[model samples]
Target chain A: PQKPFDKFFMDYIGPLPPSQGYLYVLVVVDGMTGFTWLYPTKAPSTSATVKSLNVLTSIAIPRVIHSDQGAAFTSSTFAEWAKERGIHLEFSTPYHPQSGSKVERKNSDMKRLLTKLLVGRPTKWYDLLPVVQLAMNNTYSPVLKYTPHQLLFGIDSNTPFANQDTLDLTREEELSLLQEIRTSLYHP
Target chain B: QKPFDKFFMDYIGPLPPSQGYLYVLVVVDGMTGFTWLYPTKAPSTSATVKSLNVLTSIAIPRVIHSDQGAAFTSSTFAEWAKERGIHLEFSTPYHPQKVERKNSDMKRLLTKLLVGRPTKWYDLLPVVQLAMNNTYSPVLKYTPHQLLFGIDSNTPFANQDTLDLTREEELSLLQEIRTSLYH
Candidate 1:
């Protein structure tokens, strides 16, 4: 018998724009740890969507992928993508309320943040999305006491500071040095 | 714009992550939905007051509100607000529902406009405030500039000059402009 484990929820961003708008965002969250990955895309076509997920394969291949029954998820391309990743594709049963609560809840949370940040002028929303994503990930989670940034990068991320050079390097150098530090710490 | 009564920004830093810091402050007009933006150093009262003065460029407000963080309550801030005409109000300090609601509303607007970018955009906050103030306000049934000026104000990039006129001349000019406007 398989031991019970936490599920991961993923979803497509929506209210599709008009005119050659192939943009799709894939969001994945580890229900147990509150870890998340926000991936942006220009195509929701099977091949394109799958390529974005390929970026995260090394970190975690979700056990179960939950989403609305959009064509993107139901299409054969998506079916093959899930099969190749060995993630069980679970569709929220139409009008069935409770089937994909995890992903739906995450969507609501993301939407609330999006609406709060973007309501006055939506034309500039694209510019704000990424930083907002990073901030959300870096924020401290009440339950876990660690932000999603910490979960992903192994610690809180830095912002530009005055006197930053006094610490001994530029941002690019610091990041490279941090990466080396992380690699060494993990290796030992 | 009507002018701001309070402002708040969520802070996320003290990092093993970023070298400098991340701070987002939302400024809101007390009587209007007029919002201002300020990017500051650690939400300190001194820094915040300075940021507001630099952004608003008017007399200090009668009331200043923020979430209950040590930054707002510090003695440095207490003296700062006291020195100005400001009456410091803390959201966490008072526990009032209406004030909290107002701060949250402002936060929502700031968050929507500022999602995934570097904290550097906080530097452009005053520009964001001006843009927001320039938008047509439905509640006032006019643009903020219109309400303040009692007439249509010049657009920033427009090439028109101010129509300077005495009371009698103004009436005649108004008649002429209205006639042309409707035509």
Candidate 2:
């Protein structure tokens, strides 16, 4: 497998008409595993984030959550929540996004994908984010040796493939595909 | 008639442990976040006081605040601001955290970019200053330069090929981007 480059998080994303606002999503990732969870919220506020964490998934938490001292991250609510959760919080030095390079790179990747897909489109782009996320999750990753879905949940995803009929073959066909994937780097 | 406030000035230098000799006179504006980092040969009271006067003519700050460092608490600085009807204020000695922390943001930026480099290249401080002023500040959500000038700072990046356009084109591009930002 190719060496993992960097980790990333989602920051503020989109807005459309000046009248109507859009959604904001935050993500935290594991550097080595390349595992991430998307946290959706109304605004990038500490209260909303803490509430979202309580209501959302209850998976294993990270040891350290590094971020800039943005309003959402710096609020007392977030600090207390993190303290209770036993997650160490690391704030980058002021005006230095370089310290959080992983999250920055992830944000850039998401923005590039959004720009490419939504350019010249009239439909609400925010509504299409789940589609983009699925595409990203199903694509083969060099580090994981399997799709993110399969790696996160031990099952091959049922995303639309060019040759679904061929996938209907017996266990031998599946094993051969797995062997080919192992022989090749199987990166996408 | 309204009176003008005073501000204190000091020189910090010797480029500390540099093979090539260099010094810097830090001119701080007491009222606002404006600052100038000037390379100097000496931290003498006369040289520092002169730069302070020249900088004040342009900035015209009403009050002077400084540490009890020799260069600032010197008789020369006291007389200098006093003659110009500027009020002088001094922070207690050895309490660097109280005084230095105010300008620590700029100092940290300067240290990161300049401190270890050869003294001859100290002239690059102004370029760094411009960058610092142009960065999107979370406190203001706009660059200090933008706030002061009411326009985007004119830097190499600000006038690149991608930004080359007529006023109408620029406005249209801004509108489109703003629309996308909200969408």
Candidate 3:
């Protein structure tokens, strides 16, 4: 019943080695699909959150947004922006970080992944954000039973390491393959 | 991992009973956000299993996630799913956010649509679902039907040219009907 990206949990994760003037990562997770968006920012201010959200809003507006009672989220500017769009802004209970557990979990996962990927050059963590996002999304989710990319796009994502021949599918063939996959996985 | 391989199921209702039916069996695709709505009189094991049989006739999900409700936890339902090799995943009693969100959204939408005529809400479920599947989703940036079929649904809501009059007429008719029922 939960529509994709209608309800998102947003949080800030960072203070890592500064890369290209960015020291913080803003994370937004789609509650329904577990899709994550990572944005590198210099600070976790209301302006930065709004800036990151501005880029996302060009894609689609969220219906209900959940976040901790951080200054960025509680700022009057952010409240006004949400009000202008008729989007409900929900704050997690005070002194209860578990109230926003989904995004918190995503943050932990991202940190772990980033640490592993940036072992040699931790400062370049910002450069690996997009790759990590793609890899994480393409990985299978037990709860969703499908990778976030597959759930969002209805097809397997083409990674750099994917077989070249697989990308040669014609539109018809691609559609057929997708349909066949769906049929086999879901239908008796 | 493909769409429909995993799904979540829940029951919503007991609203002003509609035609002797008070509950709706909501089955949602974990991946594509597609949904099926089935009306039932009660949340009995037999009733739930029967509704699921109708759904599996179209497509049998590999996993069915649900809350530990009596109907879902019944031996009859468990045996039925086991016979089909479908995995049954029970949500923690304390955390039911995923399915709860869907139920809440559907109920909210139905509330808006039903207004003063709650009894007739059951009858409009199909149309409601169609509209939902055809509307663009923020995360997918495409309608559920489009994502599922690789093409936009021919539903009136999906066709811009056809939407104008049909939607206007439908809205006006709904308004008229509600007014008539009340007056």
Candidate 4:
């Protein structure tokens, strides 16, 4: 957990709305840096997990991947997938581990941010998935004193306004996102 | 040479509009063949500079090679490049072959994916960009991503079903997928 890819904690976020036939988002958080990668999939199945993780592990493999004992993570095919890549799969306990406590916060915060953005257009989650990841990653972490992006990439991510710049309701949307970050900053 | 040394750039799109975007600005690294895809409302000088400005914060390229496209040829883009100490290079209207071939492959996959759900592209742009950078390139003998990040020395293949599509038709060669992905 001392390094970025040393361990990764993953979980799925929804069955809420289908955007481009995608109903769930696989959220992966680096154990040390807390940087999250968001992958939208049609279903929460082993096949989709492999499809997403392979794209991720291609950049760097983690020593271990920690997740709940969900059907997708508990399947034999999923186990084999991790084994071949030399990644040990660790399942959460019936009671929340201390780290599980933080991952719980991450998953909750993801829903909070999504709820703010998905206001009236429930199906817009797919496009906003990247932006949510962007806003959260670049937001400064009080405890860490660095944004997840800066800690993981060793550089500051200058703009929270990247994709949002060209979107509709620009500043109103921008303020909504900034308000989410402010709440996180003050709450902590 | 390492990544961020040089970038081959272009714009492709006006395809099925998604999330209000109709164009994609493509940037490929000269050393690693890694790609960055950025969605834009138009292939204008302002959009081009806005996208690259977000990128240069991560890493700046020494040179940017592109065709004499109006966006790349504009005075605003020139000043943006010069201020960052980036030298500009252009192809003789033939288009820079370095990224032109990359565009060929991108269009092929995009064309196939757009068949059933053409408007769904913007959501899938990240996946396509991730897939291409992580995909095995016959030219490089390794995935562009592994080469760029200095990892996974063998078999750059990431996932089989991620970006796969049967190639059968042609998408407009005029407009399509370009991006600005970073690790």
Candidate 5:
């Protein structure tokens, strides 16, 4: 059976060169649209994890969340948090981290982007998280045939480098493209 | 059955301890999404009993669902619920998704309300609780007050004067923008 759009994969990446005392990054990705949110925190404590996830509740609430059996995710506080929302919490098997492959891949991509962008000034990676996040969401995907932003917002994001005329498609064409995107997202 | 037949309870703080009070006990109606907020110094059974006593004076719920917090598990708290015939249901340890989510929502609203001054959260709990109960809930398709009272509750955001022309102009401008962007 297929999961709904509100299902998400969550994971924490880092212990990278500390910036402003922050060492870890919490990455959450929508399983359907591949849209992601990154939160930089000083530690992987349950409090920080709850605080980070709470930020997303303002826009949309996930029906289910998948994460590894890390202390932060397994803590009573975190479990209570998920139970209160009626959100199903799925944890990867004790020895297997590959169960949450989507979020893990996104984590790897974020690290790669940060590494390339930060270069010698690695400590400033946290400062560039928003730009990296925007680029990731805007990058086109072969499987979905459109960027995550387009899939999520029904229109292409107006990036600084993209041409202004890129979004000037006809109404019928836009509708058909959205239809195809939805089909690919739900069936694939 | 009724709207308040079951209640989900949770706590939301220990936040930058302010004015000697650092916690907000959140109680949400399971069926209607109606919420009650109470500020307390700690999460002890005494605080829970005190708060519940005040609520029971107005109306007593048939059941109260909560996680395995010490306060909920205490003999005193259990005896209180038993005496009142309020079924005390405790969620499995490490699995409190339902009430936890409600606490998250309440916290988010409180945070937005206390943007600059975080310490004043306790002072605004009552107003925040009212706003939450009056706002339309997506799950219910009606405000909690409407579900509970069979009528729309007057909220601060309700406009007495209609703006037909302004709304039409705004809708027209939005359509133009959408046309330009996605055709």
Candidate 6:
């Protein structure tokens, strides 16, 4: 967990209204930097979990993925998945979900952001995930001396514009954001 | 018109639902064969606008080839392209033979990747995009990604996307998409 891609904490945030037929969101948080990856899913099944993780591990495979023992996390298929990737899966007790608080440590902000964005047009939460993700990653952390994005990718983020109006970003700002995304995939 | 052209757009879905999405907005780079796979709630111009804004932010294309989907034909869609100096070209009622080949390949590739159950494709989309872009092609003699960025940087893997591209570098990429790629 000392490095950005070393370990990840994951959890689901909803069965919120079908944004685009999505019923749940699988949230993954990097242990070292708190950078988050948000994936919307039709269901919280083992297949869905594996599908989301596969896209992510491509950037950089994590050594461990720690989560509570939800039905999806407990499945044998899921275990085989981790095995194939050489990832160690640790299950914090479902009985005491607090044991794996890392996933929830930054959960409130996402919930709050979605709540505000979804108010005027609830189902549009699908389109808004990227913005919330950018905003969260770009948020300056007093302790880390950098945003999670900066700490992880070593790229400067469009933090100030998050609350201001990211959807209306100047061409200059959008280019940098795209750079962050491209860097994660090809450079990470 | 030409194989490995600059931009090609189309919708690929109604296959299976993931995140309420039963469709994908597929954009293929004709020059490099680099593909971008975007999951969408529907094949609406609104959705197309939403996705392409994110893409064109990186670099604008001279032309975009697509089928006659109402999504691409609408006035709203037309204006969107015009505002950005992009021209929209539609293949006769059916598919653009050039883009269809890549579409067929992606459908097959996505199918094999989601063999267990087809319900979670939206989540696997990023990997799908990466694989197609990074894959070595016998036809091109290089992966689409290498073709796209390799000319600009020996590092080939990345940094073009990270660096603030100057107008000349942008033009270089635009021209590469037009001609420098195939030869």
Q: How large is the interface RMSD of each prediction?
A: 22.4, 26.9, 16.0, 8.5, 19.4, 9.2
Q: Write the per-residue lDDT of candidate 5 for residues B22-51, one digit (tens) a residue.
A: 777777777667677766789888778756
RMSD of each: 22.5, 26.5, 21.3, 11.3, 22.0, 11.5
Candidate with best TM-score: 4
Please tell me which model should have the higher lDDT, number 2 or number 3. 3
Instruction: Residues A40-131, candidate 4: write the lDDT tens digits.
Output: 77898997798678556644667888888999999999988777556899988867574457666765666555545544346665644554
Candidate 2: tens digits of C-alpha lDDT, residues B132-152 = 444454555654444443333
Which 10-residue span in candidate 1 chain A carries the lowest summed lDDT? Answer: A159-168
Per-prediction count of colliding residue pairs? 26, 18, 0, 11, 15, 9
Candidate 2 lDDT over residue span A1-188, tens digit each: 22111232324433322211435555544454354444434577786566444422122234456666788888887888777544577776856665546546654664544444433233443333333343444456765576654444333322223333332223452334333333432321
Query: Please, what are the lDDT tens digits per residue for candidate 3 over residues A30-79?
Result: 77667677777899899778756754543345778888888999999899
Instruction: Tell me the lDDT of model 6 at A7.
Output: 79
Residue A90 in candidate 2, Cα distance off native in Å: 54
| Reference-based lDDT, residue B71, model 2 | 66
Model 6 Cα lDDT, one tens digit per residue, B1-183: 322335888886566776677777878777667677767788899889867754553345668888788899999999877755577887875543544655666555454444333765565555456545655566887766656544332331222332222245333333333332222
- Model 1, A3-51: lDDT tens digits are 1113566676643342123344566665654555555456655654565
DockQ of each: 0.01, 0.01, 0.02, 0.06, 0.02, 0.08
In model 2 chain A, where is the ten-residue run with the lowest total lDDT?
A: A1-10
Better structure of 2 and 4 per TM-score = 4
Q: How do these models rank on TM-score, best leading?
A: 4, 6, 5, 3, 2, 1
DockQ of 3: 0.02
Top-lDDT candidate index: 4
Cα lDDT tens digits, model 5, A49-164, are: 87667545422346788888899999998999777555689988845565446545654655555444434345755544543455455557777887766555444222322232
Task: Report residue A79 deviation for candidate 2 (angstroms).
Answer: 57
Lowest lDDT block of 10, candidate 3 chain B: B156-165
* TM-score per model over all chains: 0.36, 0.37, 0.44, 0.54, 0.44, 0.51
Return the clash pairs for model 6, or none. Answer: A20-B20, A21-B19, A21-B20, A22-B19, A22-B20, B4-B30, B4-B31, B5-B30, B5-B31
How big is the positional error of residue B57 in model 6, measured in Å on the Cα after superposition?
A: 13
Docking class of 2: incorrect
Candidate 6 chain A: 10-residue stretch with minimal lDDT: A156-165
